[PDB]
Coordinates of C-alpha atoms and ligand atoms in Angstrom, one line a residue:
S1 CA 27.5 -5.9 -9.1
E2 CA 25.3 -4.5 -6.6
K3 CA 22.4 -5.5 -8.8
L4 CA 23.6 -9.0 -8.9
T5 CA 23.8 -9.2 -5.1
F6 CA 20.2 -7.8 -5.0
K7 CA 18.9 -10.4 -7.4
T8 CA 20.8 -13.3 -5.6
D9 CA 19.7 -12.3 -2.2
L10 CA 16.0 -11.9 -3.2
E11 CA 16.1 -15.4 -4.9
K12 CA 17.6 -16.8 -1.8
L13 CA 14.7 -15.8 0.2
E14 CA 12.4 -17.1 -2.4
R15 CA 14.1 -20.5 -2.3
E16 CA 14.4 -20.9 1.4
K17 CA 11.0 -19.5 2.3
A18 CA 9.1 -20.9 -0.7
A19 CA 7.9 -17.4 -1.6
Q20 CA 7.5 -15.2 -4.6
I21 CA 8.8 -11.7 -4.1
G22 CA 7.7 -8.7 -6.3
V23 CA 9.8 -5.6 -5.9
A24 CA 9.9 -2.2 -7.8
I25 CA 12.0 0.7 -6.7
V26 CA 11.8 3.9 -8.8
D27 CA 13.0 7.5 -8.5
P28 CA 10.6 10.6 -8.2
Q29 CA 10.3 10.7 -12.0
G30 CA 9.3 7.0 -12.0
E31 CA 12.6 5.8 -13.6
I32 CA 13.6 2.2 -12.5
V33 CA 16.1 1.9 -9.8
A34 CA 15.7 -1.9 -9.3
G35 CA 13.2 -4.6 -9.7
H36 CA 12.1 -8.3 -9.2
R37 CA 9.3 -9.8 -10.9
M38 CA 8.4 -6.3 -11.5
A39 CA 5.7 -6.9 -14.1
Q40 CA 4.3 -10.0 -12.3
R41 CA 0.5 -9.6 -11.1
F42 CA 0.0 -9.6 -7.4
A43 CA -3.2 -9.0 -5.3
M44 CA -3.2 -5.4 -3.9
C45 CA -5.1 -6.2 -0.8
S46 CA -4.8 -3.3 1.6
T47 CA -1.9 -1.6 -0.2
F48 CA -4.8 0.0 -2.4
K49 CA -5.9 2.0 0.6
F50 CA -3.0 4.5 -0.1
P51 CA -4.2 5.1 -3.6
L52 CA -7.9 5.4 -2.2
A53 CA -6.6 8.1 0.1
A54 CA -5.0 9.9 -2.9
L55 CA -8.4 9.7 -4.8
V56 CA -10.1 11.3 -1.9
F57 CA -7.8 14.1 -1.4
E58 CA -7.9 14.7 -5.3
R59 CA -11.6 15.3 -4.8
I60 CA -10.9 17.5 -1.7
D61 CA -8.4 19.4 -3.8
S62 CA -11.0 19.8 -6.6
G63 CA -13.7 20.9 -4.3
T64 CA -15.9 17.9 -5.2
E65 CA -15.6 16.4 -1.6
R66 CA -15.1 17.8 1.9
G67 CA -12.9 16.3 4.6
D68 CA -15.6 17.2 7.2
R69 CA -18.4 15.5 5.4
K70 CA -20.0 13.0 7.9
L71 CA -20.5 9.6 6.4
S72 CA -23.2 7.8 8.4
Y73 CA -23.6 4.1 8.7
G74 CA -24.9 1.2 10.8
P75 CA -23.9 -2.1 11.9
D76 CA -23.8 -3.6 8.3
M77 CA -20.7 -1.5 7.5
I78 CA -18.7 -3.3 10.1
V79 CA -16.5 -6.1 8.5
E80 CA -13.5 -8.0 9.9
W81 CA -10.9 -5.7 11.4
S82 CA -12.7 -2.4 11.6
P83 CA -11.2 -1.0 14.9
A84 CA -12.1 2.6 14.4
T85 CA -15.4 2.0 12.6
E86 CA -16.5 0.0 15.6
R87 CA -15.6 2.6 18.0
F88 CA -17.3 5.4 16.1
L89 CA -20.4 3.3 15.3
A90 CA -22.5 4.5 18.3
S91 CA -22.0 8.1 17.3
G92 CA -23.5 7.1 13.9
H93 CA -20.8 8.4 11.5
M94 CA -17.1 9.1 10.7
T95 CA -15.9 12.1 8.7
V96 CA -14.2 11.6 5.3
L97 CA -11.1 12.5 6.9
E98 CA -11.5 10.3 9.9
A99 CA -12.3 7.3 7.6
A100 CA -9.3 8.0 5.3
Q101 CA -6.9 8.3 8.3
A102 CA -8.3 5.0 9.8
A103 CA -8.0 3.3 6.4
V104 CA -4.4 4.3 5.9
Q105 CA -3.0 4.1 9.5
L106 CA -5.2 1.2 11.0
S107 CA -6.0 -0.6 7.7
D108 CA -9.6 -0.3 9.0
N109 CA -11.8 -2.3 6.5
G110 CA -15.0 -0.8 7.5
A111 CA -13.7 2.5 7.0
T112 CA -12.4 1.5 3.6
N113 CA -15.8 0.3 2.4
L114 CA -17.4 3.5 3.9
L115 CA -15.0 5.5 1.7
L116 CA -15.5 3.4 -1.3
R117 CA -19.3 3.9 -1.0
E118 CA -18.8 7.7 -0.9
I119 CA -16.4 8.0 -3.8
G120 CA -18.2 5.6 -6.2
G121 CA -16.9 2.1 -5.6
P122 CA -14.3 -0.1 -7.3
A123 CA -15.2 1.4 -10.8
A124 CA -14.2 4.9 -9.5
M125 CA -11.0 3.6 -7.8
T126 CA -9.9 2.0 -11.1
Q127 CA -10.7 5.2 -13.0
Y128 CA -8.5 7.1 -10.8
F129 CA -5.6 4.6 -11.4
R130 CA -6.1 5.3 -15.1
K131 CA -6.3 9.1 -14.7
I132 CA -2.8 9.1 -13.0
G133 CA -1.4 7.1 -15.8
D134 CA -1.6 3.6 -14.3
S135 CA -3.1 1.2 -17.0
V136 CA -2.4 -1.9 -14.7
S137 CA -3.9 -1.6 -11.4
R138 CA -7.5 -2.5 -10.9
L139 CA -10.1 -2.6 -8.2
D140 CA -13.0 -5.0 -8.7
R141 CA -14.4 -5.9 -5.3
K142 CA -14.6 -4.4 -1.8
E143 CA -13.7 -5.6 1.7
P144 CA -13.2 -8.5 2.3
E145 CA -13.7 -10.3 -1.0
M146 CA -10.9 -8.2 -2.7
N147 CA -8.3 -10.1 -0.4
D148 CA -9.1 -13.6 -1.9
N149 CA -6.0 -13.8 -3.9
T150 CA -7.1 -16.7 -6.0
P151 CA -4.3 -17.9 -8.2
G152 CA -4.5 -16.4 -11.7
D153 CA -7.5 -14.2 -10.9
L154 CA -6.7 -10.7 -12.3
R155 CA -9.3 -9.0 -10.2
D156 CA -7.9 -6.4 -7.5
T157 CA -4.5 -6.8 -8.8
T158 CA -1.4 -4.6 -9.6
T159 CA 2.2 -5.1 -10.6
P160 CA 5.2 -4.0 -8.6
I161 CA 6.4 -1.6 -11.2
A162 CA 2.8 -0.1 -11.9
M163 CA 2.3 0.5 -8.1
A164 CA 5.7 1.9 -7.5
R165 CA 5.1 4.4 -10.4
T166 CA 1.7 5.2 -8.9
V167 CA 3.2 6.0 -5.5
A168 CA 5.8 8.2 -7.1
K169 CA 3.1 10.0 -9.1
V170 CA 1.0 10.7 -6.1
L171 CA 4.0 11.7 -3.9
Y172 CA 6.5 13.2 -6.2
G173 CA 4.6 13.8 -9.6
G174 CA 2.2 16.6 -8.6
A175 CA -1.0 14.4 -8.4
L176 CA -2.1 16.2 -5.3
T177 CA -1.7 19.7 -3.7
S178 CA 1.4 20.1 -1.5
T179 CA -1.0 20.2 1.6
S180 CA -2.8 17.0 0.6
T181 CA 0.5 15.2 -0.3
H182 CA 2.0 16.3 3.0
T183 CA -1.0 15.0 4.9
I184 CA -0.9 11.5 3.2
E185 CA 2.9 11.3 3.6
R186 CA 2.7 11.9 7.4
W187 CA -0.1 9.5 7.6
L188 CA 2.1 6.9 6.0
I189 CA 5.1 7.5 8.3
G190 CA 2.8 7.3 11.4
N191 CA 1.1 4.2 10.2
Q192 CA 0.4 1.8 12.9
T193 CA 0.6 -1.5 11.0
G194 CA 4.0 -1.5 9.5
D195 CA 6.3 -1.9 12.4
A196 CA 7.2 -5.5 11.5
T197 CA 7.2 -5.3 7.8
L198 CA 9.4 -3.2 5.4
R199 CA 10.6 -0.5 7.5
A200 CA 12.0 -3.0 10.1
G201 CA 14.5 -3.8 7.3
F202 CA 15.5 -0.1 6.7
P203 CA 18.1 1.9 8.6
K204 CA 16.7 3.7 11.6
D205 CA 17.7 7.1 10.1
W206 CA 15.8 6.7 6.8
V207 CA 12.4 8.6 6.6
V208 CA 10.0 6.0 5.6
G209 CA 6.3 5.8 5.2
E210 CA 4.3 2.9 3.9
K211 CA 0.9 1.0 3.7
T212 CA 0.8 -2.8 4.4
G213 CA -1.5 -5.4 2.9
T214 CA -2.4 -9.0 3.9
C215 CA -4.0 -11.6 1.3
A216 CA -5.3 -15.0 1.6
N217 CA -3.2 -17.6 0.3
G218 CA -0.2 -16.0 2.1
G219 CA 0.0 -12.7 0.7
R220 CA 1.9 -9.9 2.4
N221 CA 2.7 -6.6 0.9
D222 CA 4.1 -3.1 1.8
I223 CA 4.2 -0.2 -0.6
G224 CA 5.5 3.4 0.2
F225 CA 8.5 5.8 0.0
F226 CA 11.8 6.4 1.8
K227 CA 14.3 9.1 1.8
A228 CA 17.9 7.8 2.0
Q229 CA 21.1 9.8 1.7
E230 CA 19.0 12.9 0.6
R231 CA 17.5 11.1 -2.3
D232 CA 13.7 10.2 -2.5
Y233 CA 12.4 6.8 -3.7
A234 CA 9.1 5.1 -4.2
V235 CA 8.9 1.4 -3.5
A236 CA 6.4 -1.4 -4.0
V237 CA 6.8 -4.9 -2.4
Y238 CA 4.4 -7.8 -2.9
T239 CA 5.1 -11.3 -1.6
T240 CA 3.4 -14.6 -1.5
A241 CA 4.4 -17.3 0.9
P242 CA 1.6 -19.9 1.5
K243 CA 3.6 -22.0 3.9
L244 CA 5.1 -19.4 6.2
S245 CA 3.3 -18.3 9.4
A246 CA 2.0 -14.8 9.7
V247 CA 5.0 -13.7 11.9
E248 CA 7.4 -15.3 9.3
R249 CA 5.7 -13.4 6.4
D250 CA 6.3 -10.3 8.4
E251 CA 10.0 -11.2 8.7
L252 CA 10.2 -12.1 5.0
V253 CA 9.1 -8.5 4.1
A254 CA 11.4 -7.1 6.6
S255 CA 14.3 -9.2 5.0
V256 CA 13.4 -7.8 1.6
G257 CA 13.7 -4.3 3.2
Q258 CA 17.3 -5.2 4.3
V259 CA 18.1 -6.4 0.8
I260 CA 16.7 -3.1 -0.6
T261 CA 18.8 -1.2 2.1
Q262 CA 22.1 -2.9 0.9
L263 CA 21.4 -2.1 -2.8
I264 CA 20.6 1.6 -2.1
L265 CA 23.5 2.1 0.2
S266 CA 25.9 0.5 -2.2
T267 CA 25.0 3.2 -4.9
Ligands
TBE1 C1 -5.9 -5.5 3.7 O1 -4.8 -6.0 3.5 C2 -6.9 -6.1 4.5 C3 -6.8 -7.4 4.8 N1 -7.8 -8.2 5.4 C4 -7.7 -9.5 5.7 C5 -6.4 -9.7 6.5 O2 -6.0 -8.7 7.3 O3 -5.8 -10.7 6.5 C6 -9.0 -10.0 6.4 C7 -9.2 -9.2 7.6 C8 -8.8 -11.5 6.7 N2 -9.7 -12.1 7.6 C9 -10.7 -12.9 7.4 C10 -11.4 -13.2 8.6 N3 -10.6 -12.8 9.6 N4 -9.5 -12.0 8.9 S1 -10.3 -9.9 5.4 O4 -10.6 -8.5 5.2 O5 -9.8 -10.4 4.1
TF7_2 C1 -3.0 -6.8 8.9 C2 -4.1 -5.7 8.6 C3 -5.4 -6.1 9.3 N1 -5.3 -6.8 10.5 C4 -4.7 -6.5 11.6 C5 -4.9 -7.6 12.6 N2 -5.7 -8.4 11.8 N3 -6.1 -8.0 10.6 C6 -4.0 -5.6 7.1 N4 -5.1 -4.7 6.6 C7 -2.7 -4.9 6.6 O1 -2.7 -3.7 6.7 O2 -1.9 -5.7 6.1 S1 -3.4 -4.3 9.3 O3 -3.6 -4.3 11.0 O4 -1.7 -4.0 8.9

């Protein structure tokens, strides 16, 4: 079966790369298409920034936040990998929309913390997950501590199936207005950090958008959506490979993308 090939090929990567690979693919209604270690806990790291943007747009939709609100900050806001936040520092602020775009498309960590402060912190992020029917995903810390990925630590974790269903809810399940949905989808497509990961394993003609993550202890993740053969899918991929190089971890995620492609095209 196509399903057996999918399992076998993922386990081949696990064995040869000494990795753990979590995968969930669901349809727009959140029904399972395929999975691997789908109920296993993995650190979200930067993948959570996609849900964070959804939270922000939900508040914009509800009129309790404005995209043009200026969020002021100083040097203390700058953390490792804050390319946009550093550029805007002299000006003294980034708007909500600028910060959200930087968080999603550049994985800017300063901008992420700036937004977290504005919307109510990890508590607010976790409440949002709960609100959209995700009882699993949880944010406990901010950048950079949330990326520690200490084995067995439940902080700042999700499971592939929980996250994939969250992506589906946000993009296909009416969590946001069509306008806000479209804005986030286009940001995901135009993301600048995912060229070497999941989408490098998908066919050139698929419409795909995604958000990457990188965790200590060899974490490399990618979540998002793709349209293939006129059907829409939500996908979450979490990997851990402590002994691989950074480039090899990119290649691993792209390889998982190729395995996903083979399954999807066989159906
Ligand atoms: C989202 O995935 C953010 C990841 N942040 C990591 C990373 O990109 O690997 C940081 C930047 C790792 N780090 C520490 C010192 N220099 N890079 S950090 O925010 O954990
Ligand atoms: C990998 C980054 C952060 N980064 C980039 C360069 N050094 N750190 C991480 N936040 C991610 O998205 O996985 S990003 O550029 O993709």
